[PDB]
Amino acid sequence: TEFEKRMYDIRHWLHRQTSCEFHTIYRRNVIHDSAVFPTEHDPATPTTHEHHRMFSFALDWQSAPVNRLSTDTVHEGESWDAVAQRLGCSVGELKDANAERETIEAGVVINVPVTAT
Amino acid sequence: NMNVVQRPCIEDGLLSLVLEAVTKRHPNWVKAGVIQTTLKDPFDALRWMMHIFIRLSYVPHAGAATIARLSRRRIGPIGLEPHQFNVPAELGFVEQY
Amino acid sequence: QTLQNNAVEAVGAGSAPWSILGPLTAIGPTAEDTMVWLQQHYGDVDVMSIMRWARFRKGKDLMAKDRPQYLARAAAWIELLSKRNREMEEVPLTYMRKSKPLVLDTNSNVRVAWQTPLMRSGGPPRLLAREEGYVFHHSNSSRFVEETYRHPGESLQSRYLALQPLHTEVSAKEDFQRLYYQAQKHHKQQE
Amino acid sequence: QLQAQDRIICGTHGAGIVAHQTAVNSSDNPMLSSVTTAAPAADLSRTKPHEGTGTSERDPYIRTLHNQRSAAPESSVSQSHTVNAPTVDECEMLAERWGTMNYWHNDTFPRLVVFLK
Amino acid sequence: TERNTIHYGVPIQQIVDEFVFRHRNARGERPLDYFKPFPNFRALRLNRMYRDVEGFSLMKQRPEFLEWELFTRYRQHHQQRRRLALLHGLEPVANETAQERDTRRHRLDEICERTPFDEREMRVNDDEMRVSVETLRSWFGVYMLPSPTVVNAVLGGSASVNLHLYHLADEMGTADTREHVLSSRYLNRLLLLESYQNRVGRGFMNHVVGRAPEPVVPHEQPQEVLRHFSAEERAMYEQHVKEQTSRQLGEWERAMKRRRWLTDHQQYGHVVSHGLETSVVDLSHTETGAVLTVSTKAYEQEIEAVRMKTNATIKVDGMVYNLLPNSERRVVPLTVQLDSGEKIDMTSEDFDRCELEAFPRNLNHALNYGIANYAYNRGNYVETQDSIWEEQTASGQEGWSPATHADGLREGLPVRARRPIFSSSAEQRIAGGPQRAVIIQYHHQPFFNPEPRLVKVAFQCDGTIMEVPISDVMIWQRRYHGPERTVGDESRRYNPAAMRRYVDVTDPFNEKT
Amino acid sequence: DTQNDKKQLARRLGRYMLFANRSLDDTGFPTDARADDYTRWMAPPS
Amino acid sequence: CDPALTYKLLGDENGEERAQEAYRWFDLALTSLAVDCGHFVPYLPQGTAAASHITNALMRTLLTCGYTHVAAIPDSVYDRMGSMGISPTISTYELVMLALSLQGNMVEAESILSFLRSHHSEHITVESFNALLLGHREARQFDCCDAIWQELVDRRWPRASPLTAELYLRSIMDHANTPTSEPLQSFANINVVEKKKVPLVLAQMDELGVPRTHLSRVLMDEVEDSLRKFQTYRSR
Amino acid sequence: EDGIRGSEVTYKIVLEGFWDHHVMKLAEDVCMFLKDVGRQIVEEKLVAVRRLLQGGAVDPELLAAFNCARAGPFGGLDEYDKEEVANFLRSDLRRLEEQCLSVINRCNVPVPGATNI
Amino acid sequence: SHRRDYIRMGYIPRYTPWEWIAIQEADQPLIAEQIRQDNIGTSYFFSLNRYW
Amino acid sequence: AEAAVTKFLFQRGSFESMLHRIITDALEKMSTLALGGQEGNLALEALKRQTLFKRNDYIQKRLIDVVSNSAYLGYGDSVWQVFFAAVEANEENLLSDRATTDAIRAAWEGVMREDVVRLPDVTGVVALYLTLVCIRESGRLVPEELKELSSGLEDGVRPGVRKLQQYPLIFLHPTVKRRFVVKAVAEILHNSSS
Amino acid sequence: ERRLRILAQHRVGMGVLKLDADKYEDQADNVTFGTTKLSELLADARKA
Amino acid sequence: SANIPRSVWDPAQHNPNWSDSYGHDITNRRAWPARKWTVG
């Protein structure tokens, strides 16, 4: 940042009637979340050319990423492994995300482990 | 012919002894399954060498990101979860004042 | 147990003299003796409130369900929050030799090391290092040495050519723990 | 790498090329006719850090040497690719050390033969 | 507290500028080469002395006729010695102790003596005369620029009365005219002769040898200050001078008794009698593993009988030892007196490890008497230049650094290159640890050497030739700065009257000759 | 050795500041002035 | 709120008597230890960790007395500790560094850290960097004060403490308020530019997890000033 | 990549005048400025690196970052010990010293008769 | 500043003097958003949707 | 004793302790249950000596003499070169669908795909192991002419290498050479004309 | 990789994937946008 | 770091290969005599 600072500041002592631009190219970590942008099978119904008309961009599509719920309610007959099965997790995972709760009653709100399929 | 040297002979006994030694220096490689103590196959000697060379030189992506953030001060967040992946990237842009 | 481990790692593995007497006093058999002990060794932190804070973990009350998990937690926290504890838990480190520059200059990187009376028995009686002209000096390329010169005879080479600087290489540190351990090993072998 | 760098460049005030033993006395030469014989230097006087009364080289009219800490520039010799002689301290710990193949088999002072011996 | 005001002074560049401006280009101080066509950046600067003139005392202050040429050739010899050093791997190591340095220098010496001096490398600084080795020899004497036969003689022999003035015969029966590179040890052997001492201006060495330095009294006074001391204050001054003189001279006495602390007898000890130098071997006991030492001249028969592998074990006094792998050394027997008025017999080697009672910084002072103390032989040009090399290596001014395109890469330059490893499995390339190598050819011109730049290089190990990425090559830097970091700085002969100097405008470089 | 004896007491005092290198002015106290100034004032006669 | 000044001023509260007491109690302590230990019979008292602990206590106190005693830590106390046979701990070395650095002796402080780095590296706490920072600031070498901070940002461990950030920032304000000589004073006071480092340092303190609200009220006034000189947002 | 062809960050300053020689001489000015400032910064970084090379601990955090994988290349959760990790770190620092030295050494090439920017 | 010939006798610096660069650079503020620190992540949902 | 020689080879303190245990037990059980001469104890001391020598000689001759010639190993680089050459010749065994898991092939391939492949620093034991393995491989990779004798490991591994061998006689002594040339020129000049 | 190349057509060259994010007036928002498109494109390419 | 780099003002860091301003430019405008030889 110190070099960058000297460099941005050379604009104050530049020669007469001369200006400048600063191009920067730096390296930066990006993060690809398979949680937010999951890789899934193509839908059971496909998408036509018809979802691509003009203004389809404004009408037929949401902005990516899609919102996938991180919270699920436990049904009556359900159990730890039944809930894990319904959500697509290992039971271990579902217990770690929910660590506060030891046992799960019907009609209780639960955290869905982010890796769930 | 004074400069010419005899190519030494290395018996499997020696090789397996040295391999135990390696295993006892780096226990974690036997745990994590980099090398096996056993020398059975003809190519096993070479194979373990190659596994070692890979373990030492191949940097796991999360580690790579962390290392680059330390001394080169590379900014960006860095994901430690298995479902995240650290992509080294560039950003170009302009400034004018 | 920490004291014990540190004393073993000192020698690189028997037990060193390090562990024999530690900074922690043994606790008297009473409630008030306990509170007094906690007070005087760990008392820069507030110990009581830490023991309270460490009670619940993720809604689960530890004190009334898992006793040893709770215990280890409260212990570990009081450990982390005191500076006094940090001080009394330190690992014994080797002792750094002060040095002076060579009398016949060859390397600026080669220095004459000081030797504590423990490392050289015999030898003429010496003062303390600073009084003798030794200083703290070290760098990546430092090398330490015991400096002396070859005895010149009666010959041409003695009169005309310069003195010949014989160096003998020495470590820059002194492991007091290893010296003690190995000397007691000698005493258990002799006996 | 001048001879007596310290004494001349770092030690002396003129960098060796200013003549500090010169009298500011009036000369009969035509170029020096402006030069007027100077009063003698003031006795107990407190100078400004960049000036002196001009008596000696140790006390110039103009103090050239900085009053800060001086440090020789960081050597551009590679420290990581250079292999020094093995020390006592290094050879005791040789069994924990991580070297390059060039460090173990080095032409001068190979460390593998030491690990073995 | 003084540092509360920051005073940067005036930067050296600004000073030099004001000087050369005030002198209207200061032509008195410029090398004569500044006045000839296309001076390189080194001719562009002022006339300061560099470190290269330091060990040559033949030329005193005014060098006489041909002396400066002789010196110039000595200087070259050293540059070549450095080149050989880099080539074969013996150069100063920043870490090195004294025995290591001793060994290293020794090998370098042997390799110097067997290598021919290269006259192509020799260049002439402004105004200097070109002079052949033959002319130099016949003027200054052959001992000065010795032929290998002469060197061999001096190193193998004894006598003083021979300083070799004229050439020597050779195995083919001719006069050996060969100039090999000069060597530290040869010049030391010359420093032993009285005649040579006189020739190089060190004659004083003979008179001064055992003696003390002349006492230096702190705050010693002129007569003109002393004239104002009252009788009592003058008594005090005398007391002071007396005490300093006595203290110093006594300190020198103690120093030159050369007493060492013997640990076994818990006493100081002192050397009365020297024996001659015996070759000695080590014998290890078979049963106990004990270690003994033996005169090889006494046991010669049996030892040689073991060297022939016939009877492999040496019996002495019913205790039998095995001869060690090498353990052949040259030691001197010493009779060491003890403060009890006692006598011991001790090897040179063992008495050497012992600890001195007096180890003053000024111990070598006699060798340059009244000039500063030196730990090396200053009368030896090669050894001095070598010592400077090691100093500058220790301090990070010299050593292996990543090469630039400006550093003077050329045929013959020693180099450390990261040896390319070839795998088909590798896209791009594989680098391996730096190895010693020489440059075979390096093209400067961009159109012969497109990016990334290459260097053709012959690796010293197996003699293998390759192109290497210039980013993989390291050169031995002489200084921090550059552009040419590889070549040394050359002092130029001093000119008393500088304004009168003449350039021939038609042939500025003296090409018609 | 023995607690609070002569030698221990001496080593507590530290390094001895030489009276030569002391810079005392007219009042017998160390100077206000910068070292370069004081040095010049007290320099030997010629 | 300056940590260095606090040592210096503490020295003026009966520093000599507290020192003498400390030495006395230290000897009392060594006697008591030798009693409690009664193989390693010969080095049993010095060998024990307790002995090391006590020696450290002695040093940590002597810092608080006058100049004389501070100067005596890296000289006599440490030598006597070597002589006695008592092995040191990381806090021994950091106290010796803090002593050397209050004295302004940078070469030796940095030496000790070098030795540590080389042999004992895994044990180095932040307080050695703190020692060095305080020291360089005292010797008024601000480029070193900077070098050591930048290094401590590169290795991100040990973790910088609010005290560290405080010492570095203070050293910057100190730098910014020094004058140059008259030659450079004709147009303006140059050294103000240093204050303009500050909004960079503050940004680093957020990357490092050093909470910016542990900084003395005093320093935070100077810093807030420094900010209002050079910092502005894209809005303004 | 090695030598000239590789870096963490690139800055391009695009200077613009109304007259060609203006912009040429500005470029010499700014260039020599960045040469000096660059050498100062990169030298500082270089001393930091040489110190980190000489020795140091490992973050608990950096170790944790090497050890977050459900499976490594050898098909199981892999245990990097602090040693190995320190070795990765060390290797990168090595490379950074080469690069720093390369930049510094080119800062020192362009002297007055010889300058080609 | 010691150079009495500065514009009068024809001396014009080819390189802008260090002291001047320092003054110039010390007069103006530095923009905060130029410092470029991102340690959290990218905000997918909320960032592009923020208050009008 | 034979067991001890082989097994504890690379940590020597451990070996000393085990020899001491073995022979001190042999000495207990030797003292009582034996009879009228002291020759037994001499024989056990002689067994400590024999064992020690057998081990020291085992690591001298089979390790230190193998590895100590550093030029022959091309100062560690020949060692690396061989390695890659070996992995080249044997790919259908090391990196192949039947040979190894996709993960490992990916990691290999990934290490090899970088702009510069830098060779990893390595622990002493590992250094030894690597060196030994590569000596053994070098044996097979080389032409049958060079298998037994050559100068350097890597010799003959890559066919196309241009060396600098060019001087046949320069290594020879000057005197011999000289006399030869004088005699031969004396004959050529005094014999024929052309 | 084949799927990545076919999905982002002229947005790959010399084996470098390059997205130019112009959508929003401010650079900050364009790194947000650009980063999103990148992970969305990787998410789809990864279907292979 | 420091606003004005050590290299500028510290004589330890003095660059011996730098030359003064006047010298190079005087040397440069030199036009040496074109008749170096007879005949041409």
PDB file of N, CA and C in Angstrom, chain E residues 442-474:
ATOM      1  N   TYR E 442      27.356 -15.447 -24.924  1.00  0.00           N
ATOM      2  CA  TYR E 442      26.147 -14.735 -24.565  1.00  0.00           C
ATOM      3  C   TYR E 442      25.941 -13.593 -25.537  1.00  0.00           C
ATOM      4  N   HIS E 443      24.855 -13.665 -26.293  1.00  0.00           N
ATOM      5  CA  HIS E 443      24.539 -12.624 -27.245  1.00  0.00           C
ATOM      6  C   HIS E 443      23.873 -11.447 -26.557  1.00  0.00           C
ATOM      7  N   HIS E 444      24.389 -10.247 -26.777  1.00  0.00           N
ATOM      8  CA  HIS E 444      23.749  -9.065 -26.222  1.00  0.00           C
ATOM      9  C   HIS E 444      22.582  -8.620 -27.065  1.00  0.00           C
ATOM     10  N   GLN E 445      22.784  -8.694 -28.372  1.00  0.00           N
ATOM     11  CA  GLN E 445      21.843  -8.154 -29.331  1.00  0.00           C
ATOM     12  C   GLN E 445      20.488  -8.882 -29.312  1.00  0.00           C
ATOM     13  N   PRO E 446      19.428  -8.132 -29.016  1.00  0.00           N
ATOM     14  CA  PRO E 446      18.047  -8.568 -28.861  1.00  0.00           C
ATOM     15  C   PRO E 446      17.578  -9.482 -29.973  1.00  0.00           C
ATOM     16  N   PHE E 447      18.082  -9.258 -31.175  1.00  0.00           N
ATOM     17  CA  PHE E 447      17.632 -10.031 -32.315  1.00  0.00           C
ATOM     18  C   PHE E 447      18.356 -11.373 -32.408  1.00  0.00           C
ATOM     19  N   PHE E 448      19.474 -11.541 -31.709  1.00  0.00           N
ATOM     20  CA  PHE E 448      20.069 -12.874 -31.610  1.00  0.00           C
ATOM     21  C   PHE E 448      19.614 -13.612 -30.360  1.00  0.00           C
ATOM     22  N   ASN E 449      18.956 -12.888 -29.463  1.00  0.00           N
ATOM     23  CA  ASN E 449      18.597 -13.422 -28.155  1.00  0.00           C
ATOM     24  C   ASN E 449      17.244 -12.894 -27.684  1.00  0.00           C
ATOM     25  N   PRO E 450      16.164 -13.374 -28.292  1.00  0.00           N
ATOM     26  CA  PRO E 450      14.791 -12.927 -28.007  1.00  0.00           C
ATOM     27  C   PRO E 450      14.337 -13.360 -26.615  1.00  0.00           C
ATOM     28  N   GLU E 451      13.234 -12.818 -26.104  1.00  0.00           N
ATOM     29  CA  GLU E 451      12.757 -13.170 -24.760  1.00  0.00           C
ATOM     30  C   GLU E 451      12.180 -14.576 -24.673  1.00  0.00           C
ATOM     31  N   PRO E 452      12.394 -15.255 -23.533  1.00  0.00           N
ATOM     32  CA  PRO E 452      13.299 -14.898 -22.431  1.00  0.00           C
ATOM     33  C   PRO E 452      14.774 -15.177 -22.757  1.00  0.00           C
ATOM     34  N   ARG E 453      15.673 -14.274 -22.363  1.00  0.00           N
ATOM     35  CA  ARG E 453      17.079 -14.331 -22.778  1.00  0.00           C
ATOM     36  C   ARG E 453      17.817 -15.603 -22.357  1.00  0.00           C
ATOM     37  N   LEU E 454      18.768 -16.040 -23.170  1.00  0.00           N
ATOM     38  CA  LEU E 454      19.493 -17.271 -22.875  1.00  0.00           C
ATOM     39  C   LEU E 454      20.998 -17.089 -22.776  1.00  0.00           C
ATOM     40  N   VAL E 455      21.643 -18.008 -22.073  1.00  0.00           N
ATOM     41  CA  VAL E 455      23.080 -18.000 -21.937  1.00  0.00           C
ATOM     42  C   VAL E 455      23.591 -19.395 -22.259  1.00  0.00           C
ATOM     43  N   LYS E 456      24.523 -19.511 -23.200  1.00  0.00           N
ATOM     44  CA  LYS E 456      25.121 -20.810 -23.463  1.00  0.00           C
ATOM     45  C   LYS E 456      26.229 -21.023 -22.449  1.00  0.00           C
ATOM     46  N   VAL E 457      26.214 -22.176 -21.809  1.00  0.00           N
ATOM     47  CA  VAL E 457      26.961 -22.372 -20.586  1.00  0.00           C
ATOM     48  C   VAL E 457      27.493 -23.800 -20.563  1.00  0.00           C
ATOM     49  N   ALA E 458      28.732 -23.985 -20.120  1.00  0.00           N
ATOM     50  CA  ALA E 458      29.266 -25.328 -19.940  1.00  0.00           C
ATOM     51  C   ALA E 458      29.437 -25.619 -18.457  1.00  0.00           C
ATOM     52  N   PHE E 459      28.614 -26.542 -17.960  1.00  0.00           N
ATOM     53  CA  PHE E 459      28.665 -26.995 -16.583  1.00  0.00           C
ATOM     54  C   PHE E 459      29.930 -27.773 -16.313  1.00  0.00           C
ATOM     55  N   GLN E 460      30.568 -27.413 -15.199  1.00  0.00           N
ATOM     56  CA  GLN E 460      31.905 -27.856 -14.800  1.00  0.00           C
ATOM     57  C   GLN E 460      31.991 -29.298 -14.385  1.00  0.00           C
ATOM     58  N   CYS E 461      30.914 -29.788 -13.786  1.00  0.00           N
ATOM     59  CA  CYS E 461      30.846 -31.154 -13.293  1.00  0.00           C
ATOM     60  C   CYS E 461      31.163 -32.190 -14.389  1.00  0.00           C
ATOM     61  N   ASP E 462      30.231 -32.391 -15.320  1.00  0.00           N
ATOM     62  CA  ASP E 462      30.411 -33.348 -16.410  1.00  0.00           C
ATOM     63  C   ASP E 462      30.839 -32.707 -17.733  1.00  0.00           C
ATOM     64  N   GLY E 463      31.075 -31.402 -17.725  1.00  0.00           N
ATOM     65  CA  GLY E 463      31.479 -30.707 -18.934  1.00  0.00           C
ATOM     66  C   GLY E 463      30.346 -30.566 -19.932  1.00  0.00           C
ATOM     67  N   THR E 464      29.132 -30.319 -19.446  1.00  0.00           N
ATOM     68  CA  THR E 464      27.955 -30.375 -20.338  1.00  0.00           C
ATOM     69  C   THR E 464      27.502 -29.002 -20.826  1.00  0.00           C
ATOM     70  N   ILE E 465      27.150 -28.870 -22.103  1.00  0.00           N
ATOM     71  CA  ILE E 465      26.728 -27.564 -22.619  1.00  0.00           C
ATOM     72  C   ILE E 465      25.205 -27.418 -22.732  1.00  0.00           C
ATOM     73  N   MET E 466      24.699 -26.251 -22.338  1.00  0.00           N
ATOM     74  CA  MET E 466      23.271 -25.969 -22.385  1.00  0.00           C
ATOM     75  C   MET E 466      22.958 -24.501 -22.598  1.00  0.00           C
ATOM     76  N   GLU E 467      21.735 -24.224 -23.033  1.00  0.00           N
ATOM     77  CA  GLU E 467      21.186 -22.878 -22.943  1.00  0.00           C
ATOM     78  C   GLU E 467      20.431 -22.777 -21.628  1.00  0.00           C
ATOM     79  N   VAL E 468      20.686 -21.715 -20.878  1.00  0.00           N
ATOM     80  CA  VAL E 468      20.022 -21.516 -19.601  1.00  0.00           C
ATOM     81  C   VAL E 468      19.334 -20.154 -19.598  1.00  0.00           C
ATOM     82  N   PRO E 469      18.115 -20.070 -19.045  1.00  0.00           N
ATOM     83  CA  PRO E 469      17.444 -18.778 -18.869  1.00  0.00           C
ATOM     84  C   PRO E 469      18.285 -17.825 -18.042  1.00  0.00           C
ATOM     85  N   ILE E 470      18.534 -16.608 -18.519  1.00  0.00           N
ATOM     86  CA  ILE E 470      19.407 -15.686 -17.795  1.00  0.00           C
ATOM     87  C   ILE E 470      18.926 -15.441 -16.355  1.00  0.00           C
ATOM     88  N   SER E 471      17.632 -15.636 -16.106  1.00  0.00           N
ATOM     89  CA  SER E 471      17.063 -15.469 -14.770  1.00  0.00           C
ATOM     90  C   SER E 471      17.516 -16.569 -13.817  1.00  0.00           C
ATOM     91  N   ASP E 472      18.131 -17.602 -14.385  1.00  0.00           N
ATOM     92  CA  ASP E 472      18.665 -18.727 -13.626  1.00  0.00           C
ATOM     93  C   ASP E 472      20.159 -18.676 -13.381  1.00  0.00           C
ATOM     94  N   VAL E 473      20.798 -17.586 -13.762  1.00  0.00           N
ATOM     95  CA  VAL E 473      22.237 -17.515 -13.629  1.00  0.00           C
ATOM     96  C   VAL E 473      22.640 -16.529 -12.541  1.00  0.00           C
ATOM     97  N   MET E 474      23.663 -16.897 -11.781  1.00  0.00           N
ATOM     98  CA  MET E 474      24.221 -16.023 -10.773  1.00  0.00           C
ATOM     99  C   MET E 474      25.680 -15.738 -11.088  1.00  0.00           C
TER     100      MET E 474
END
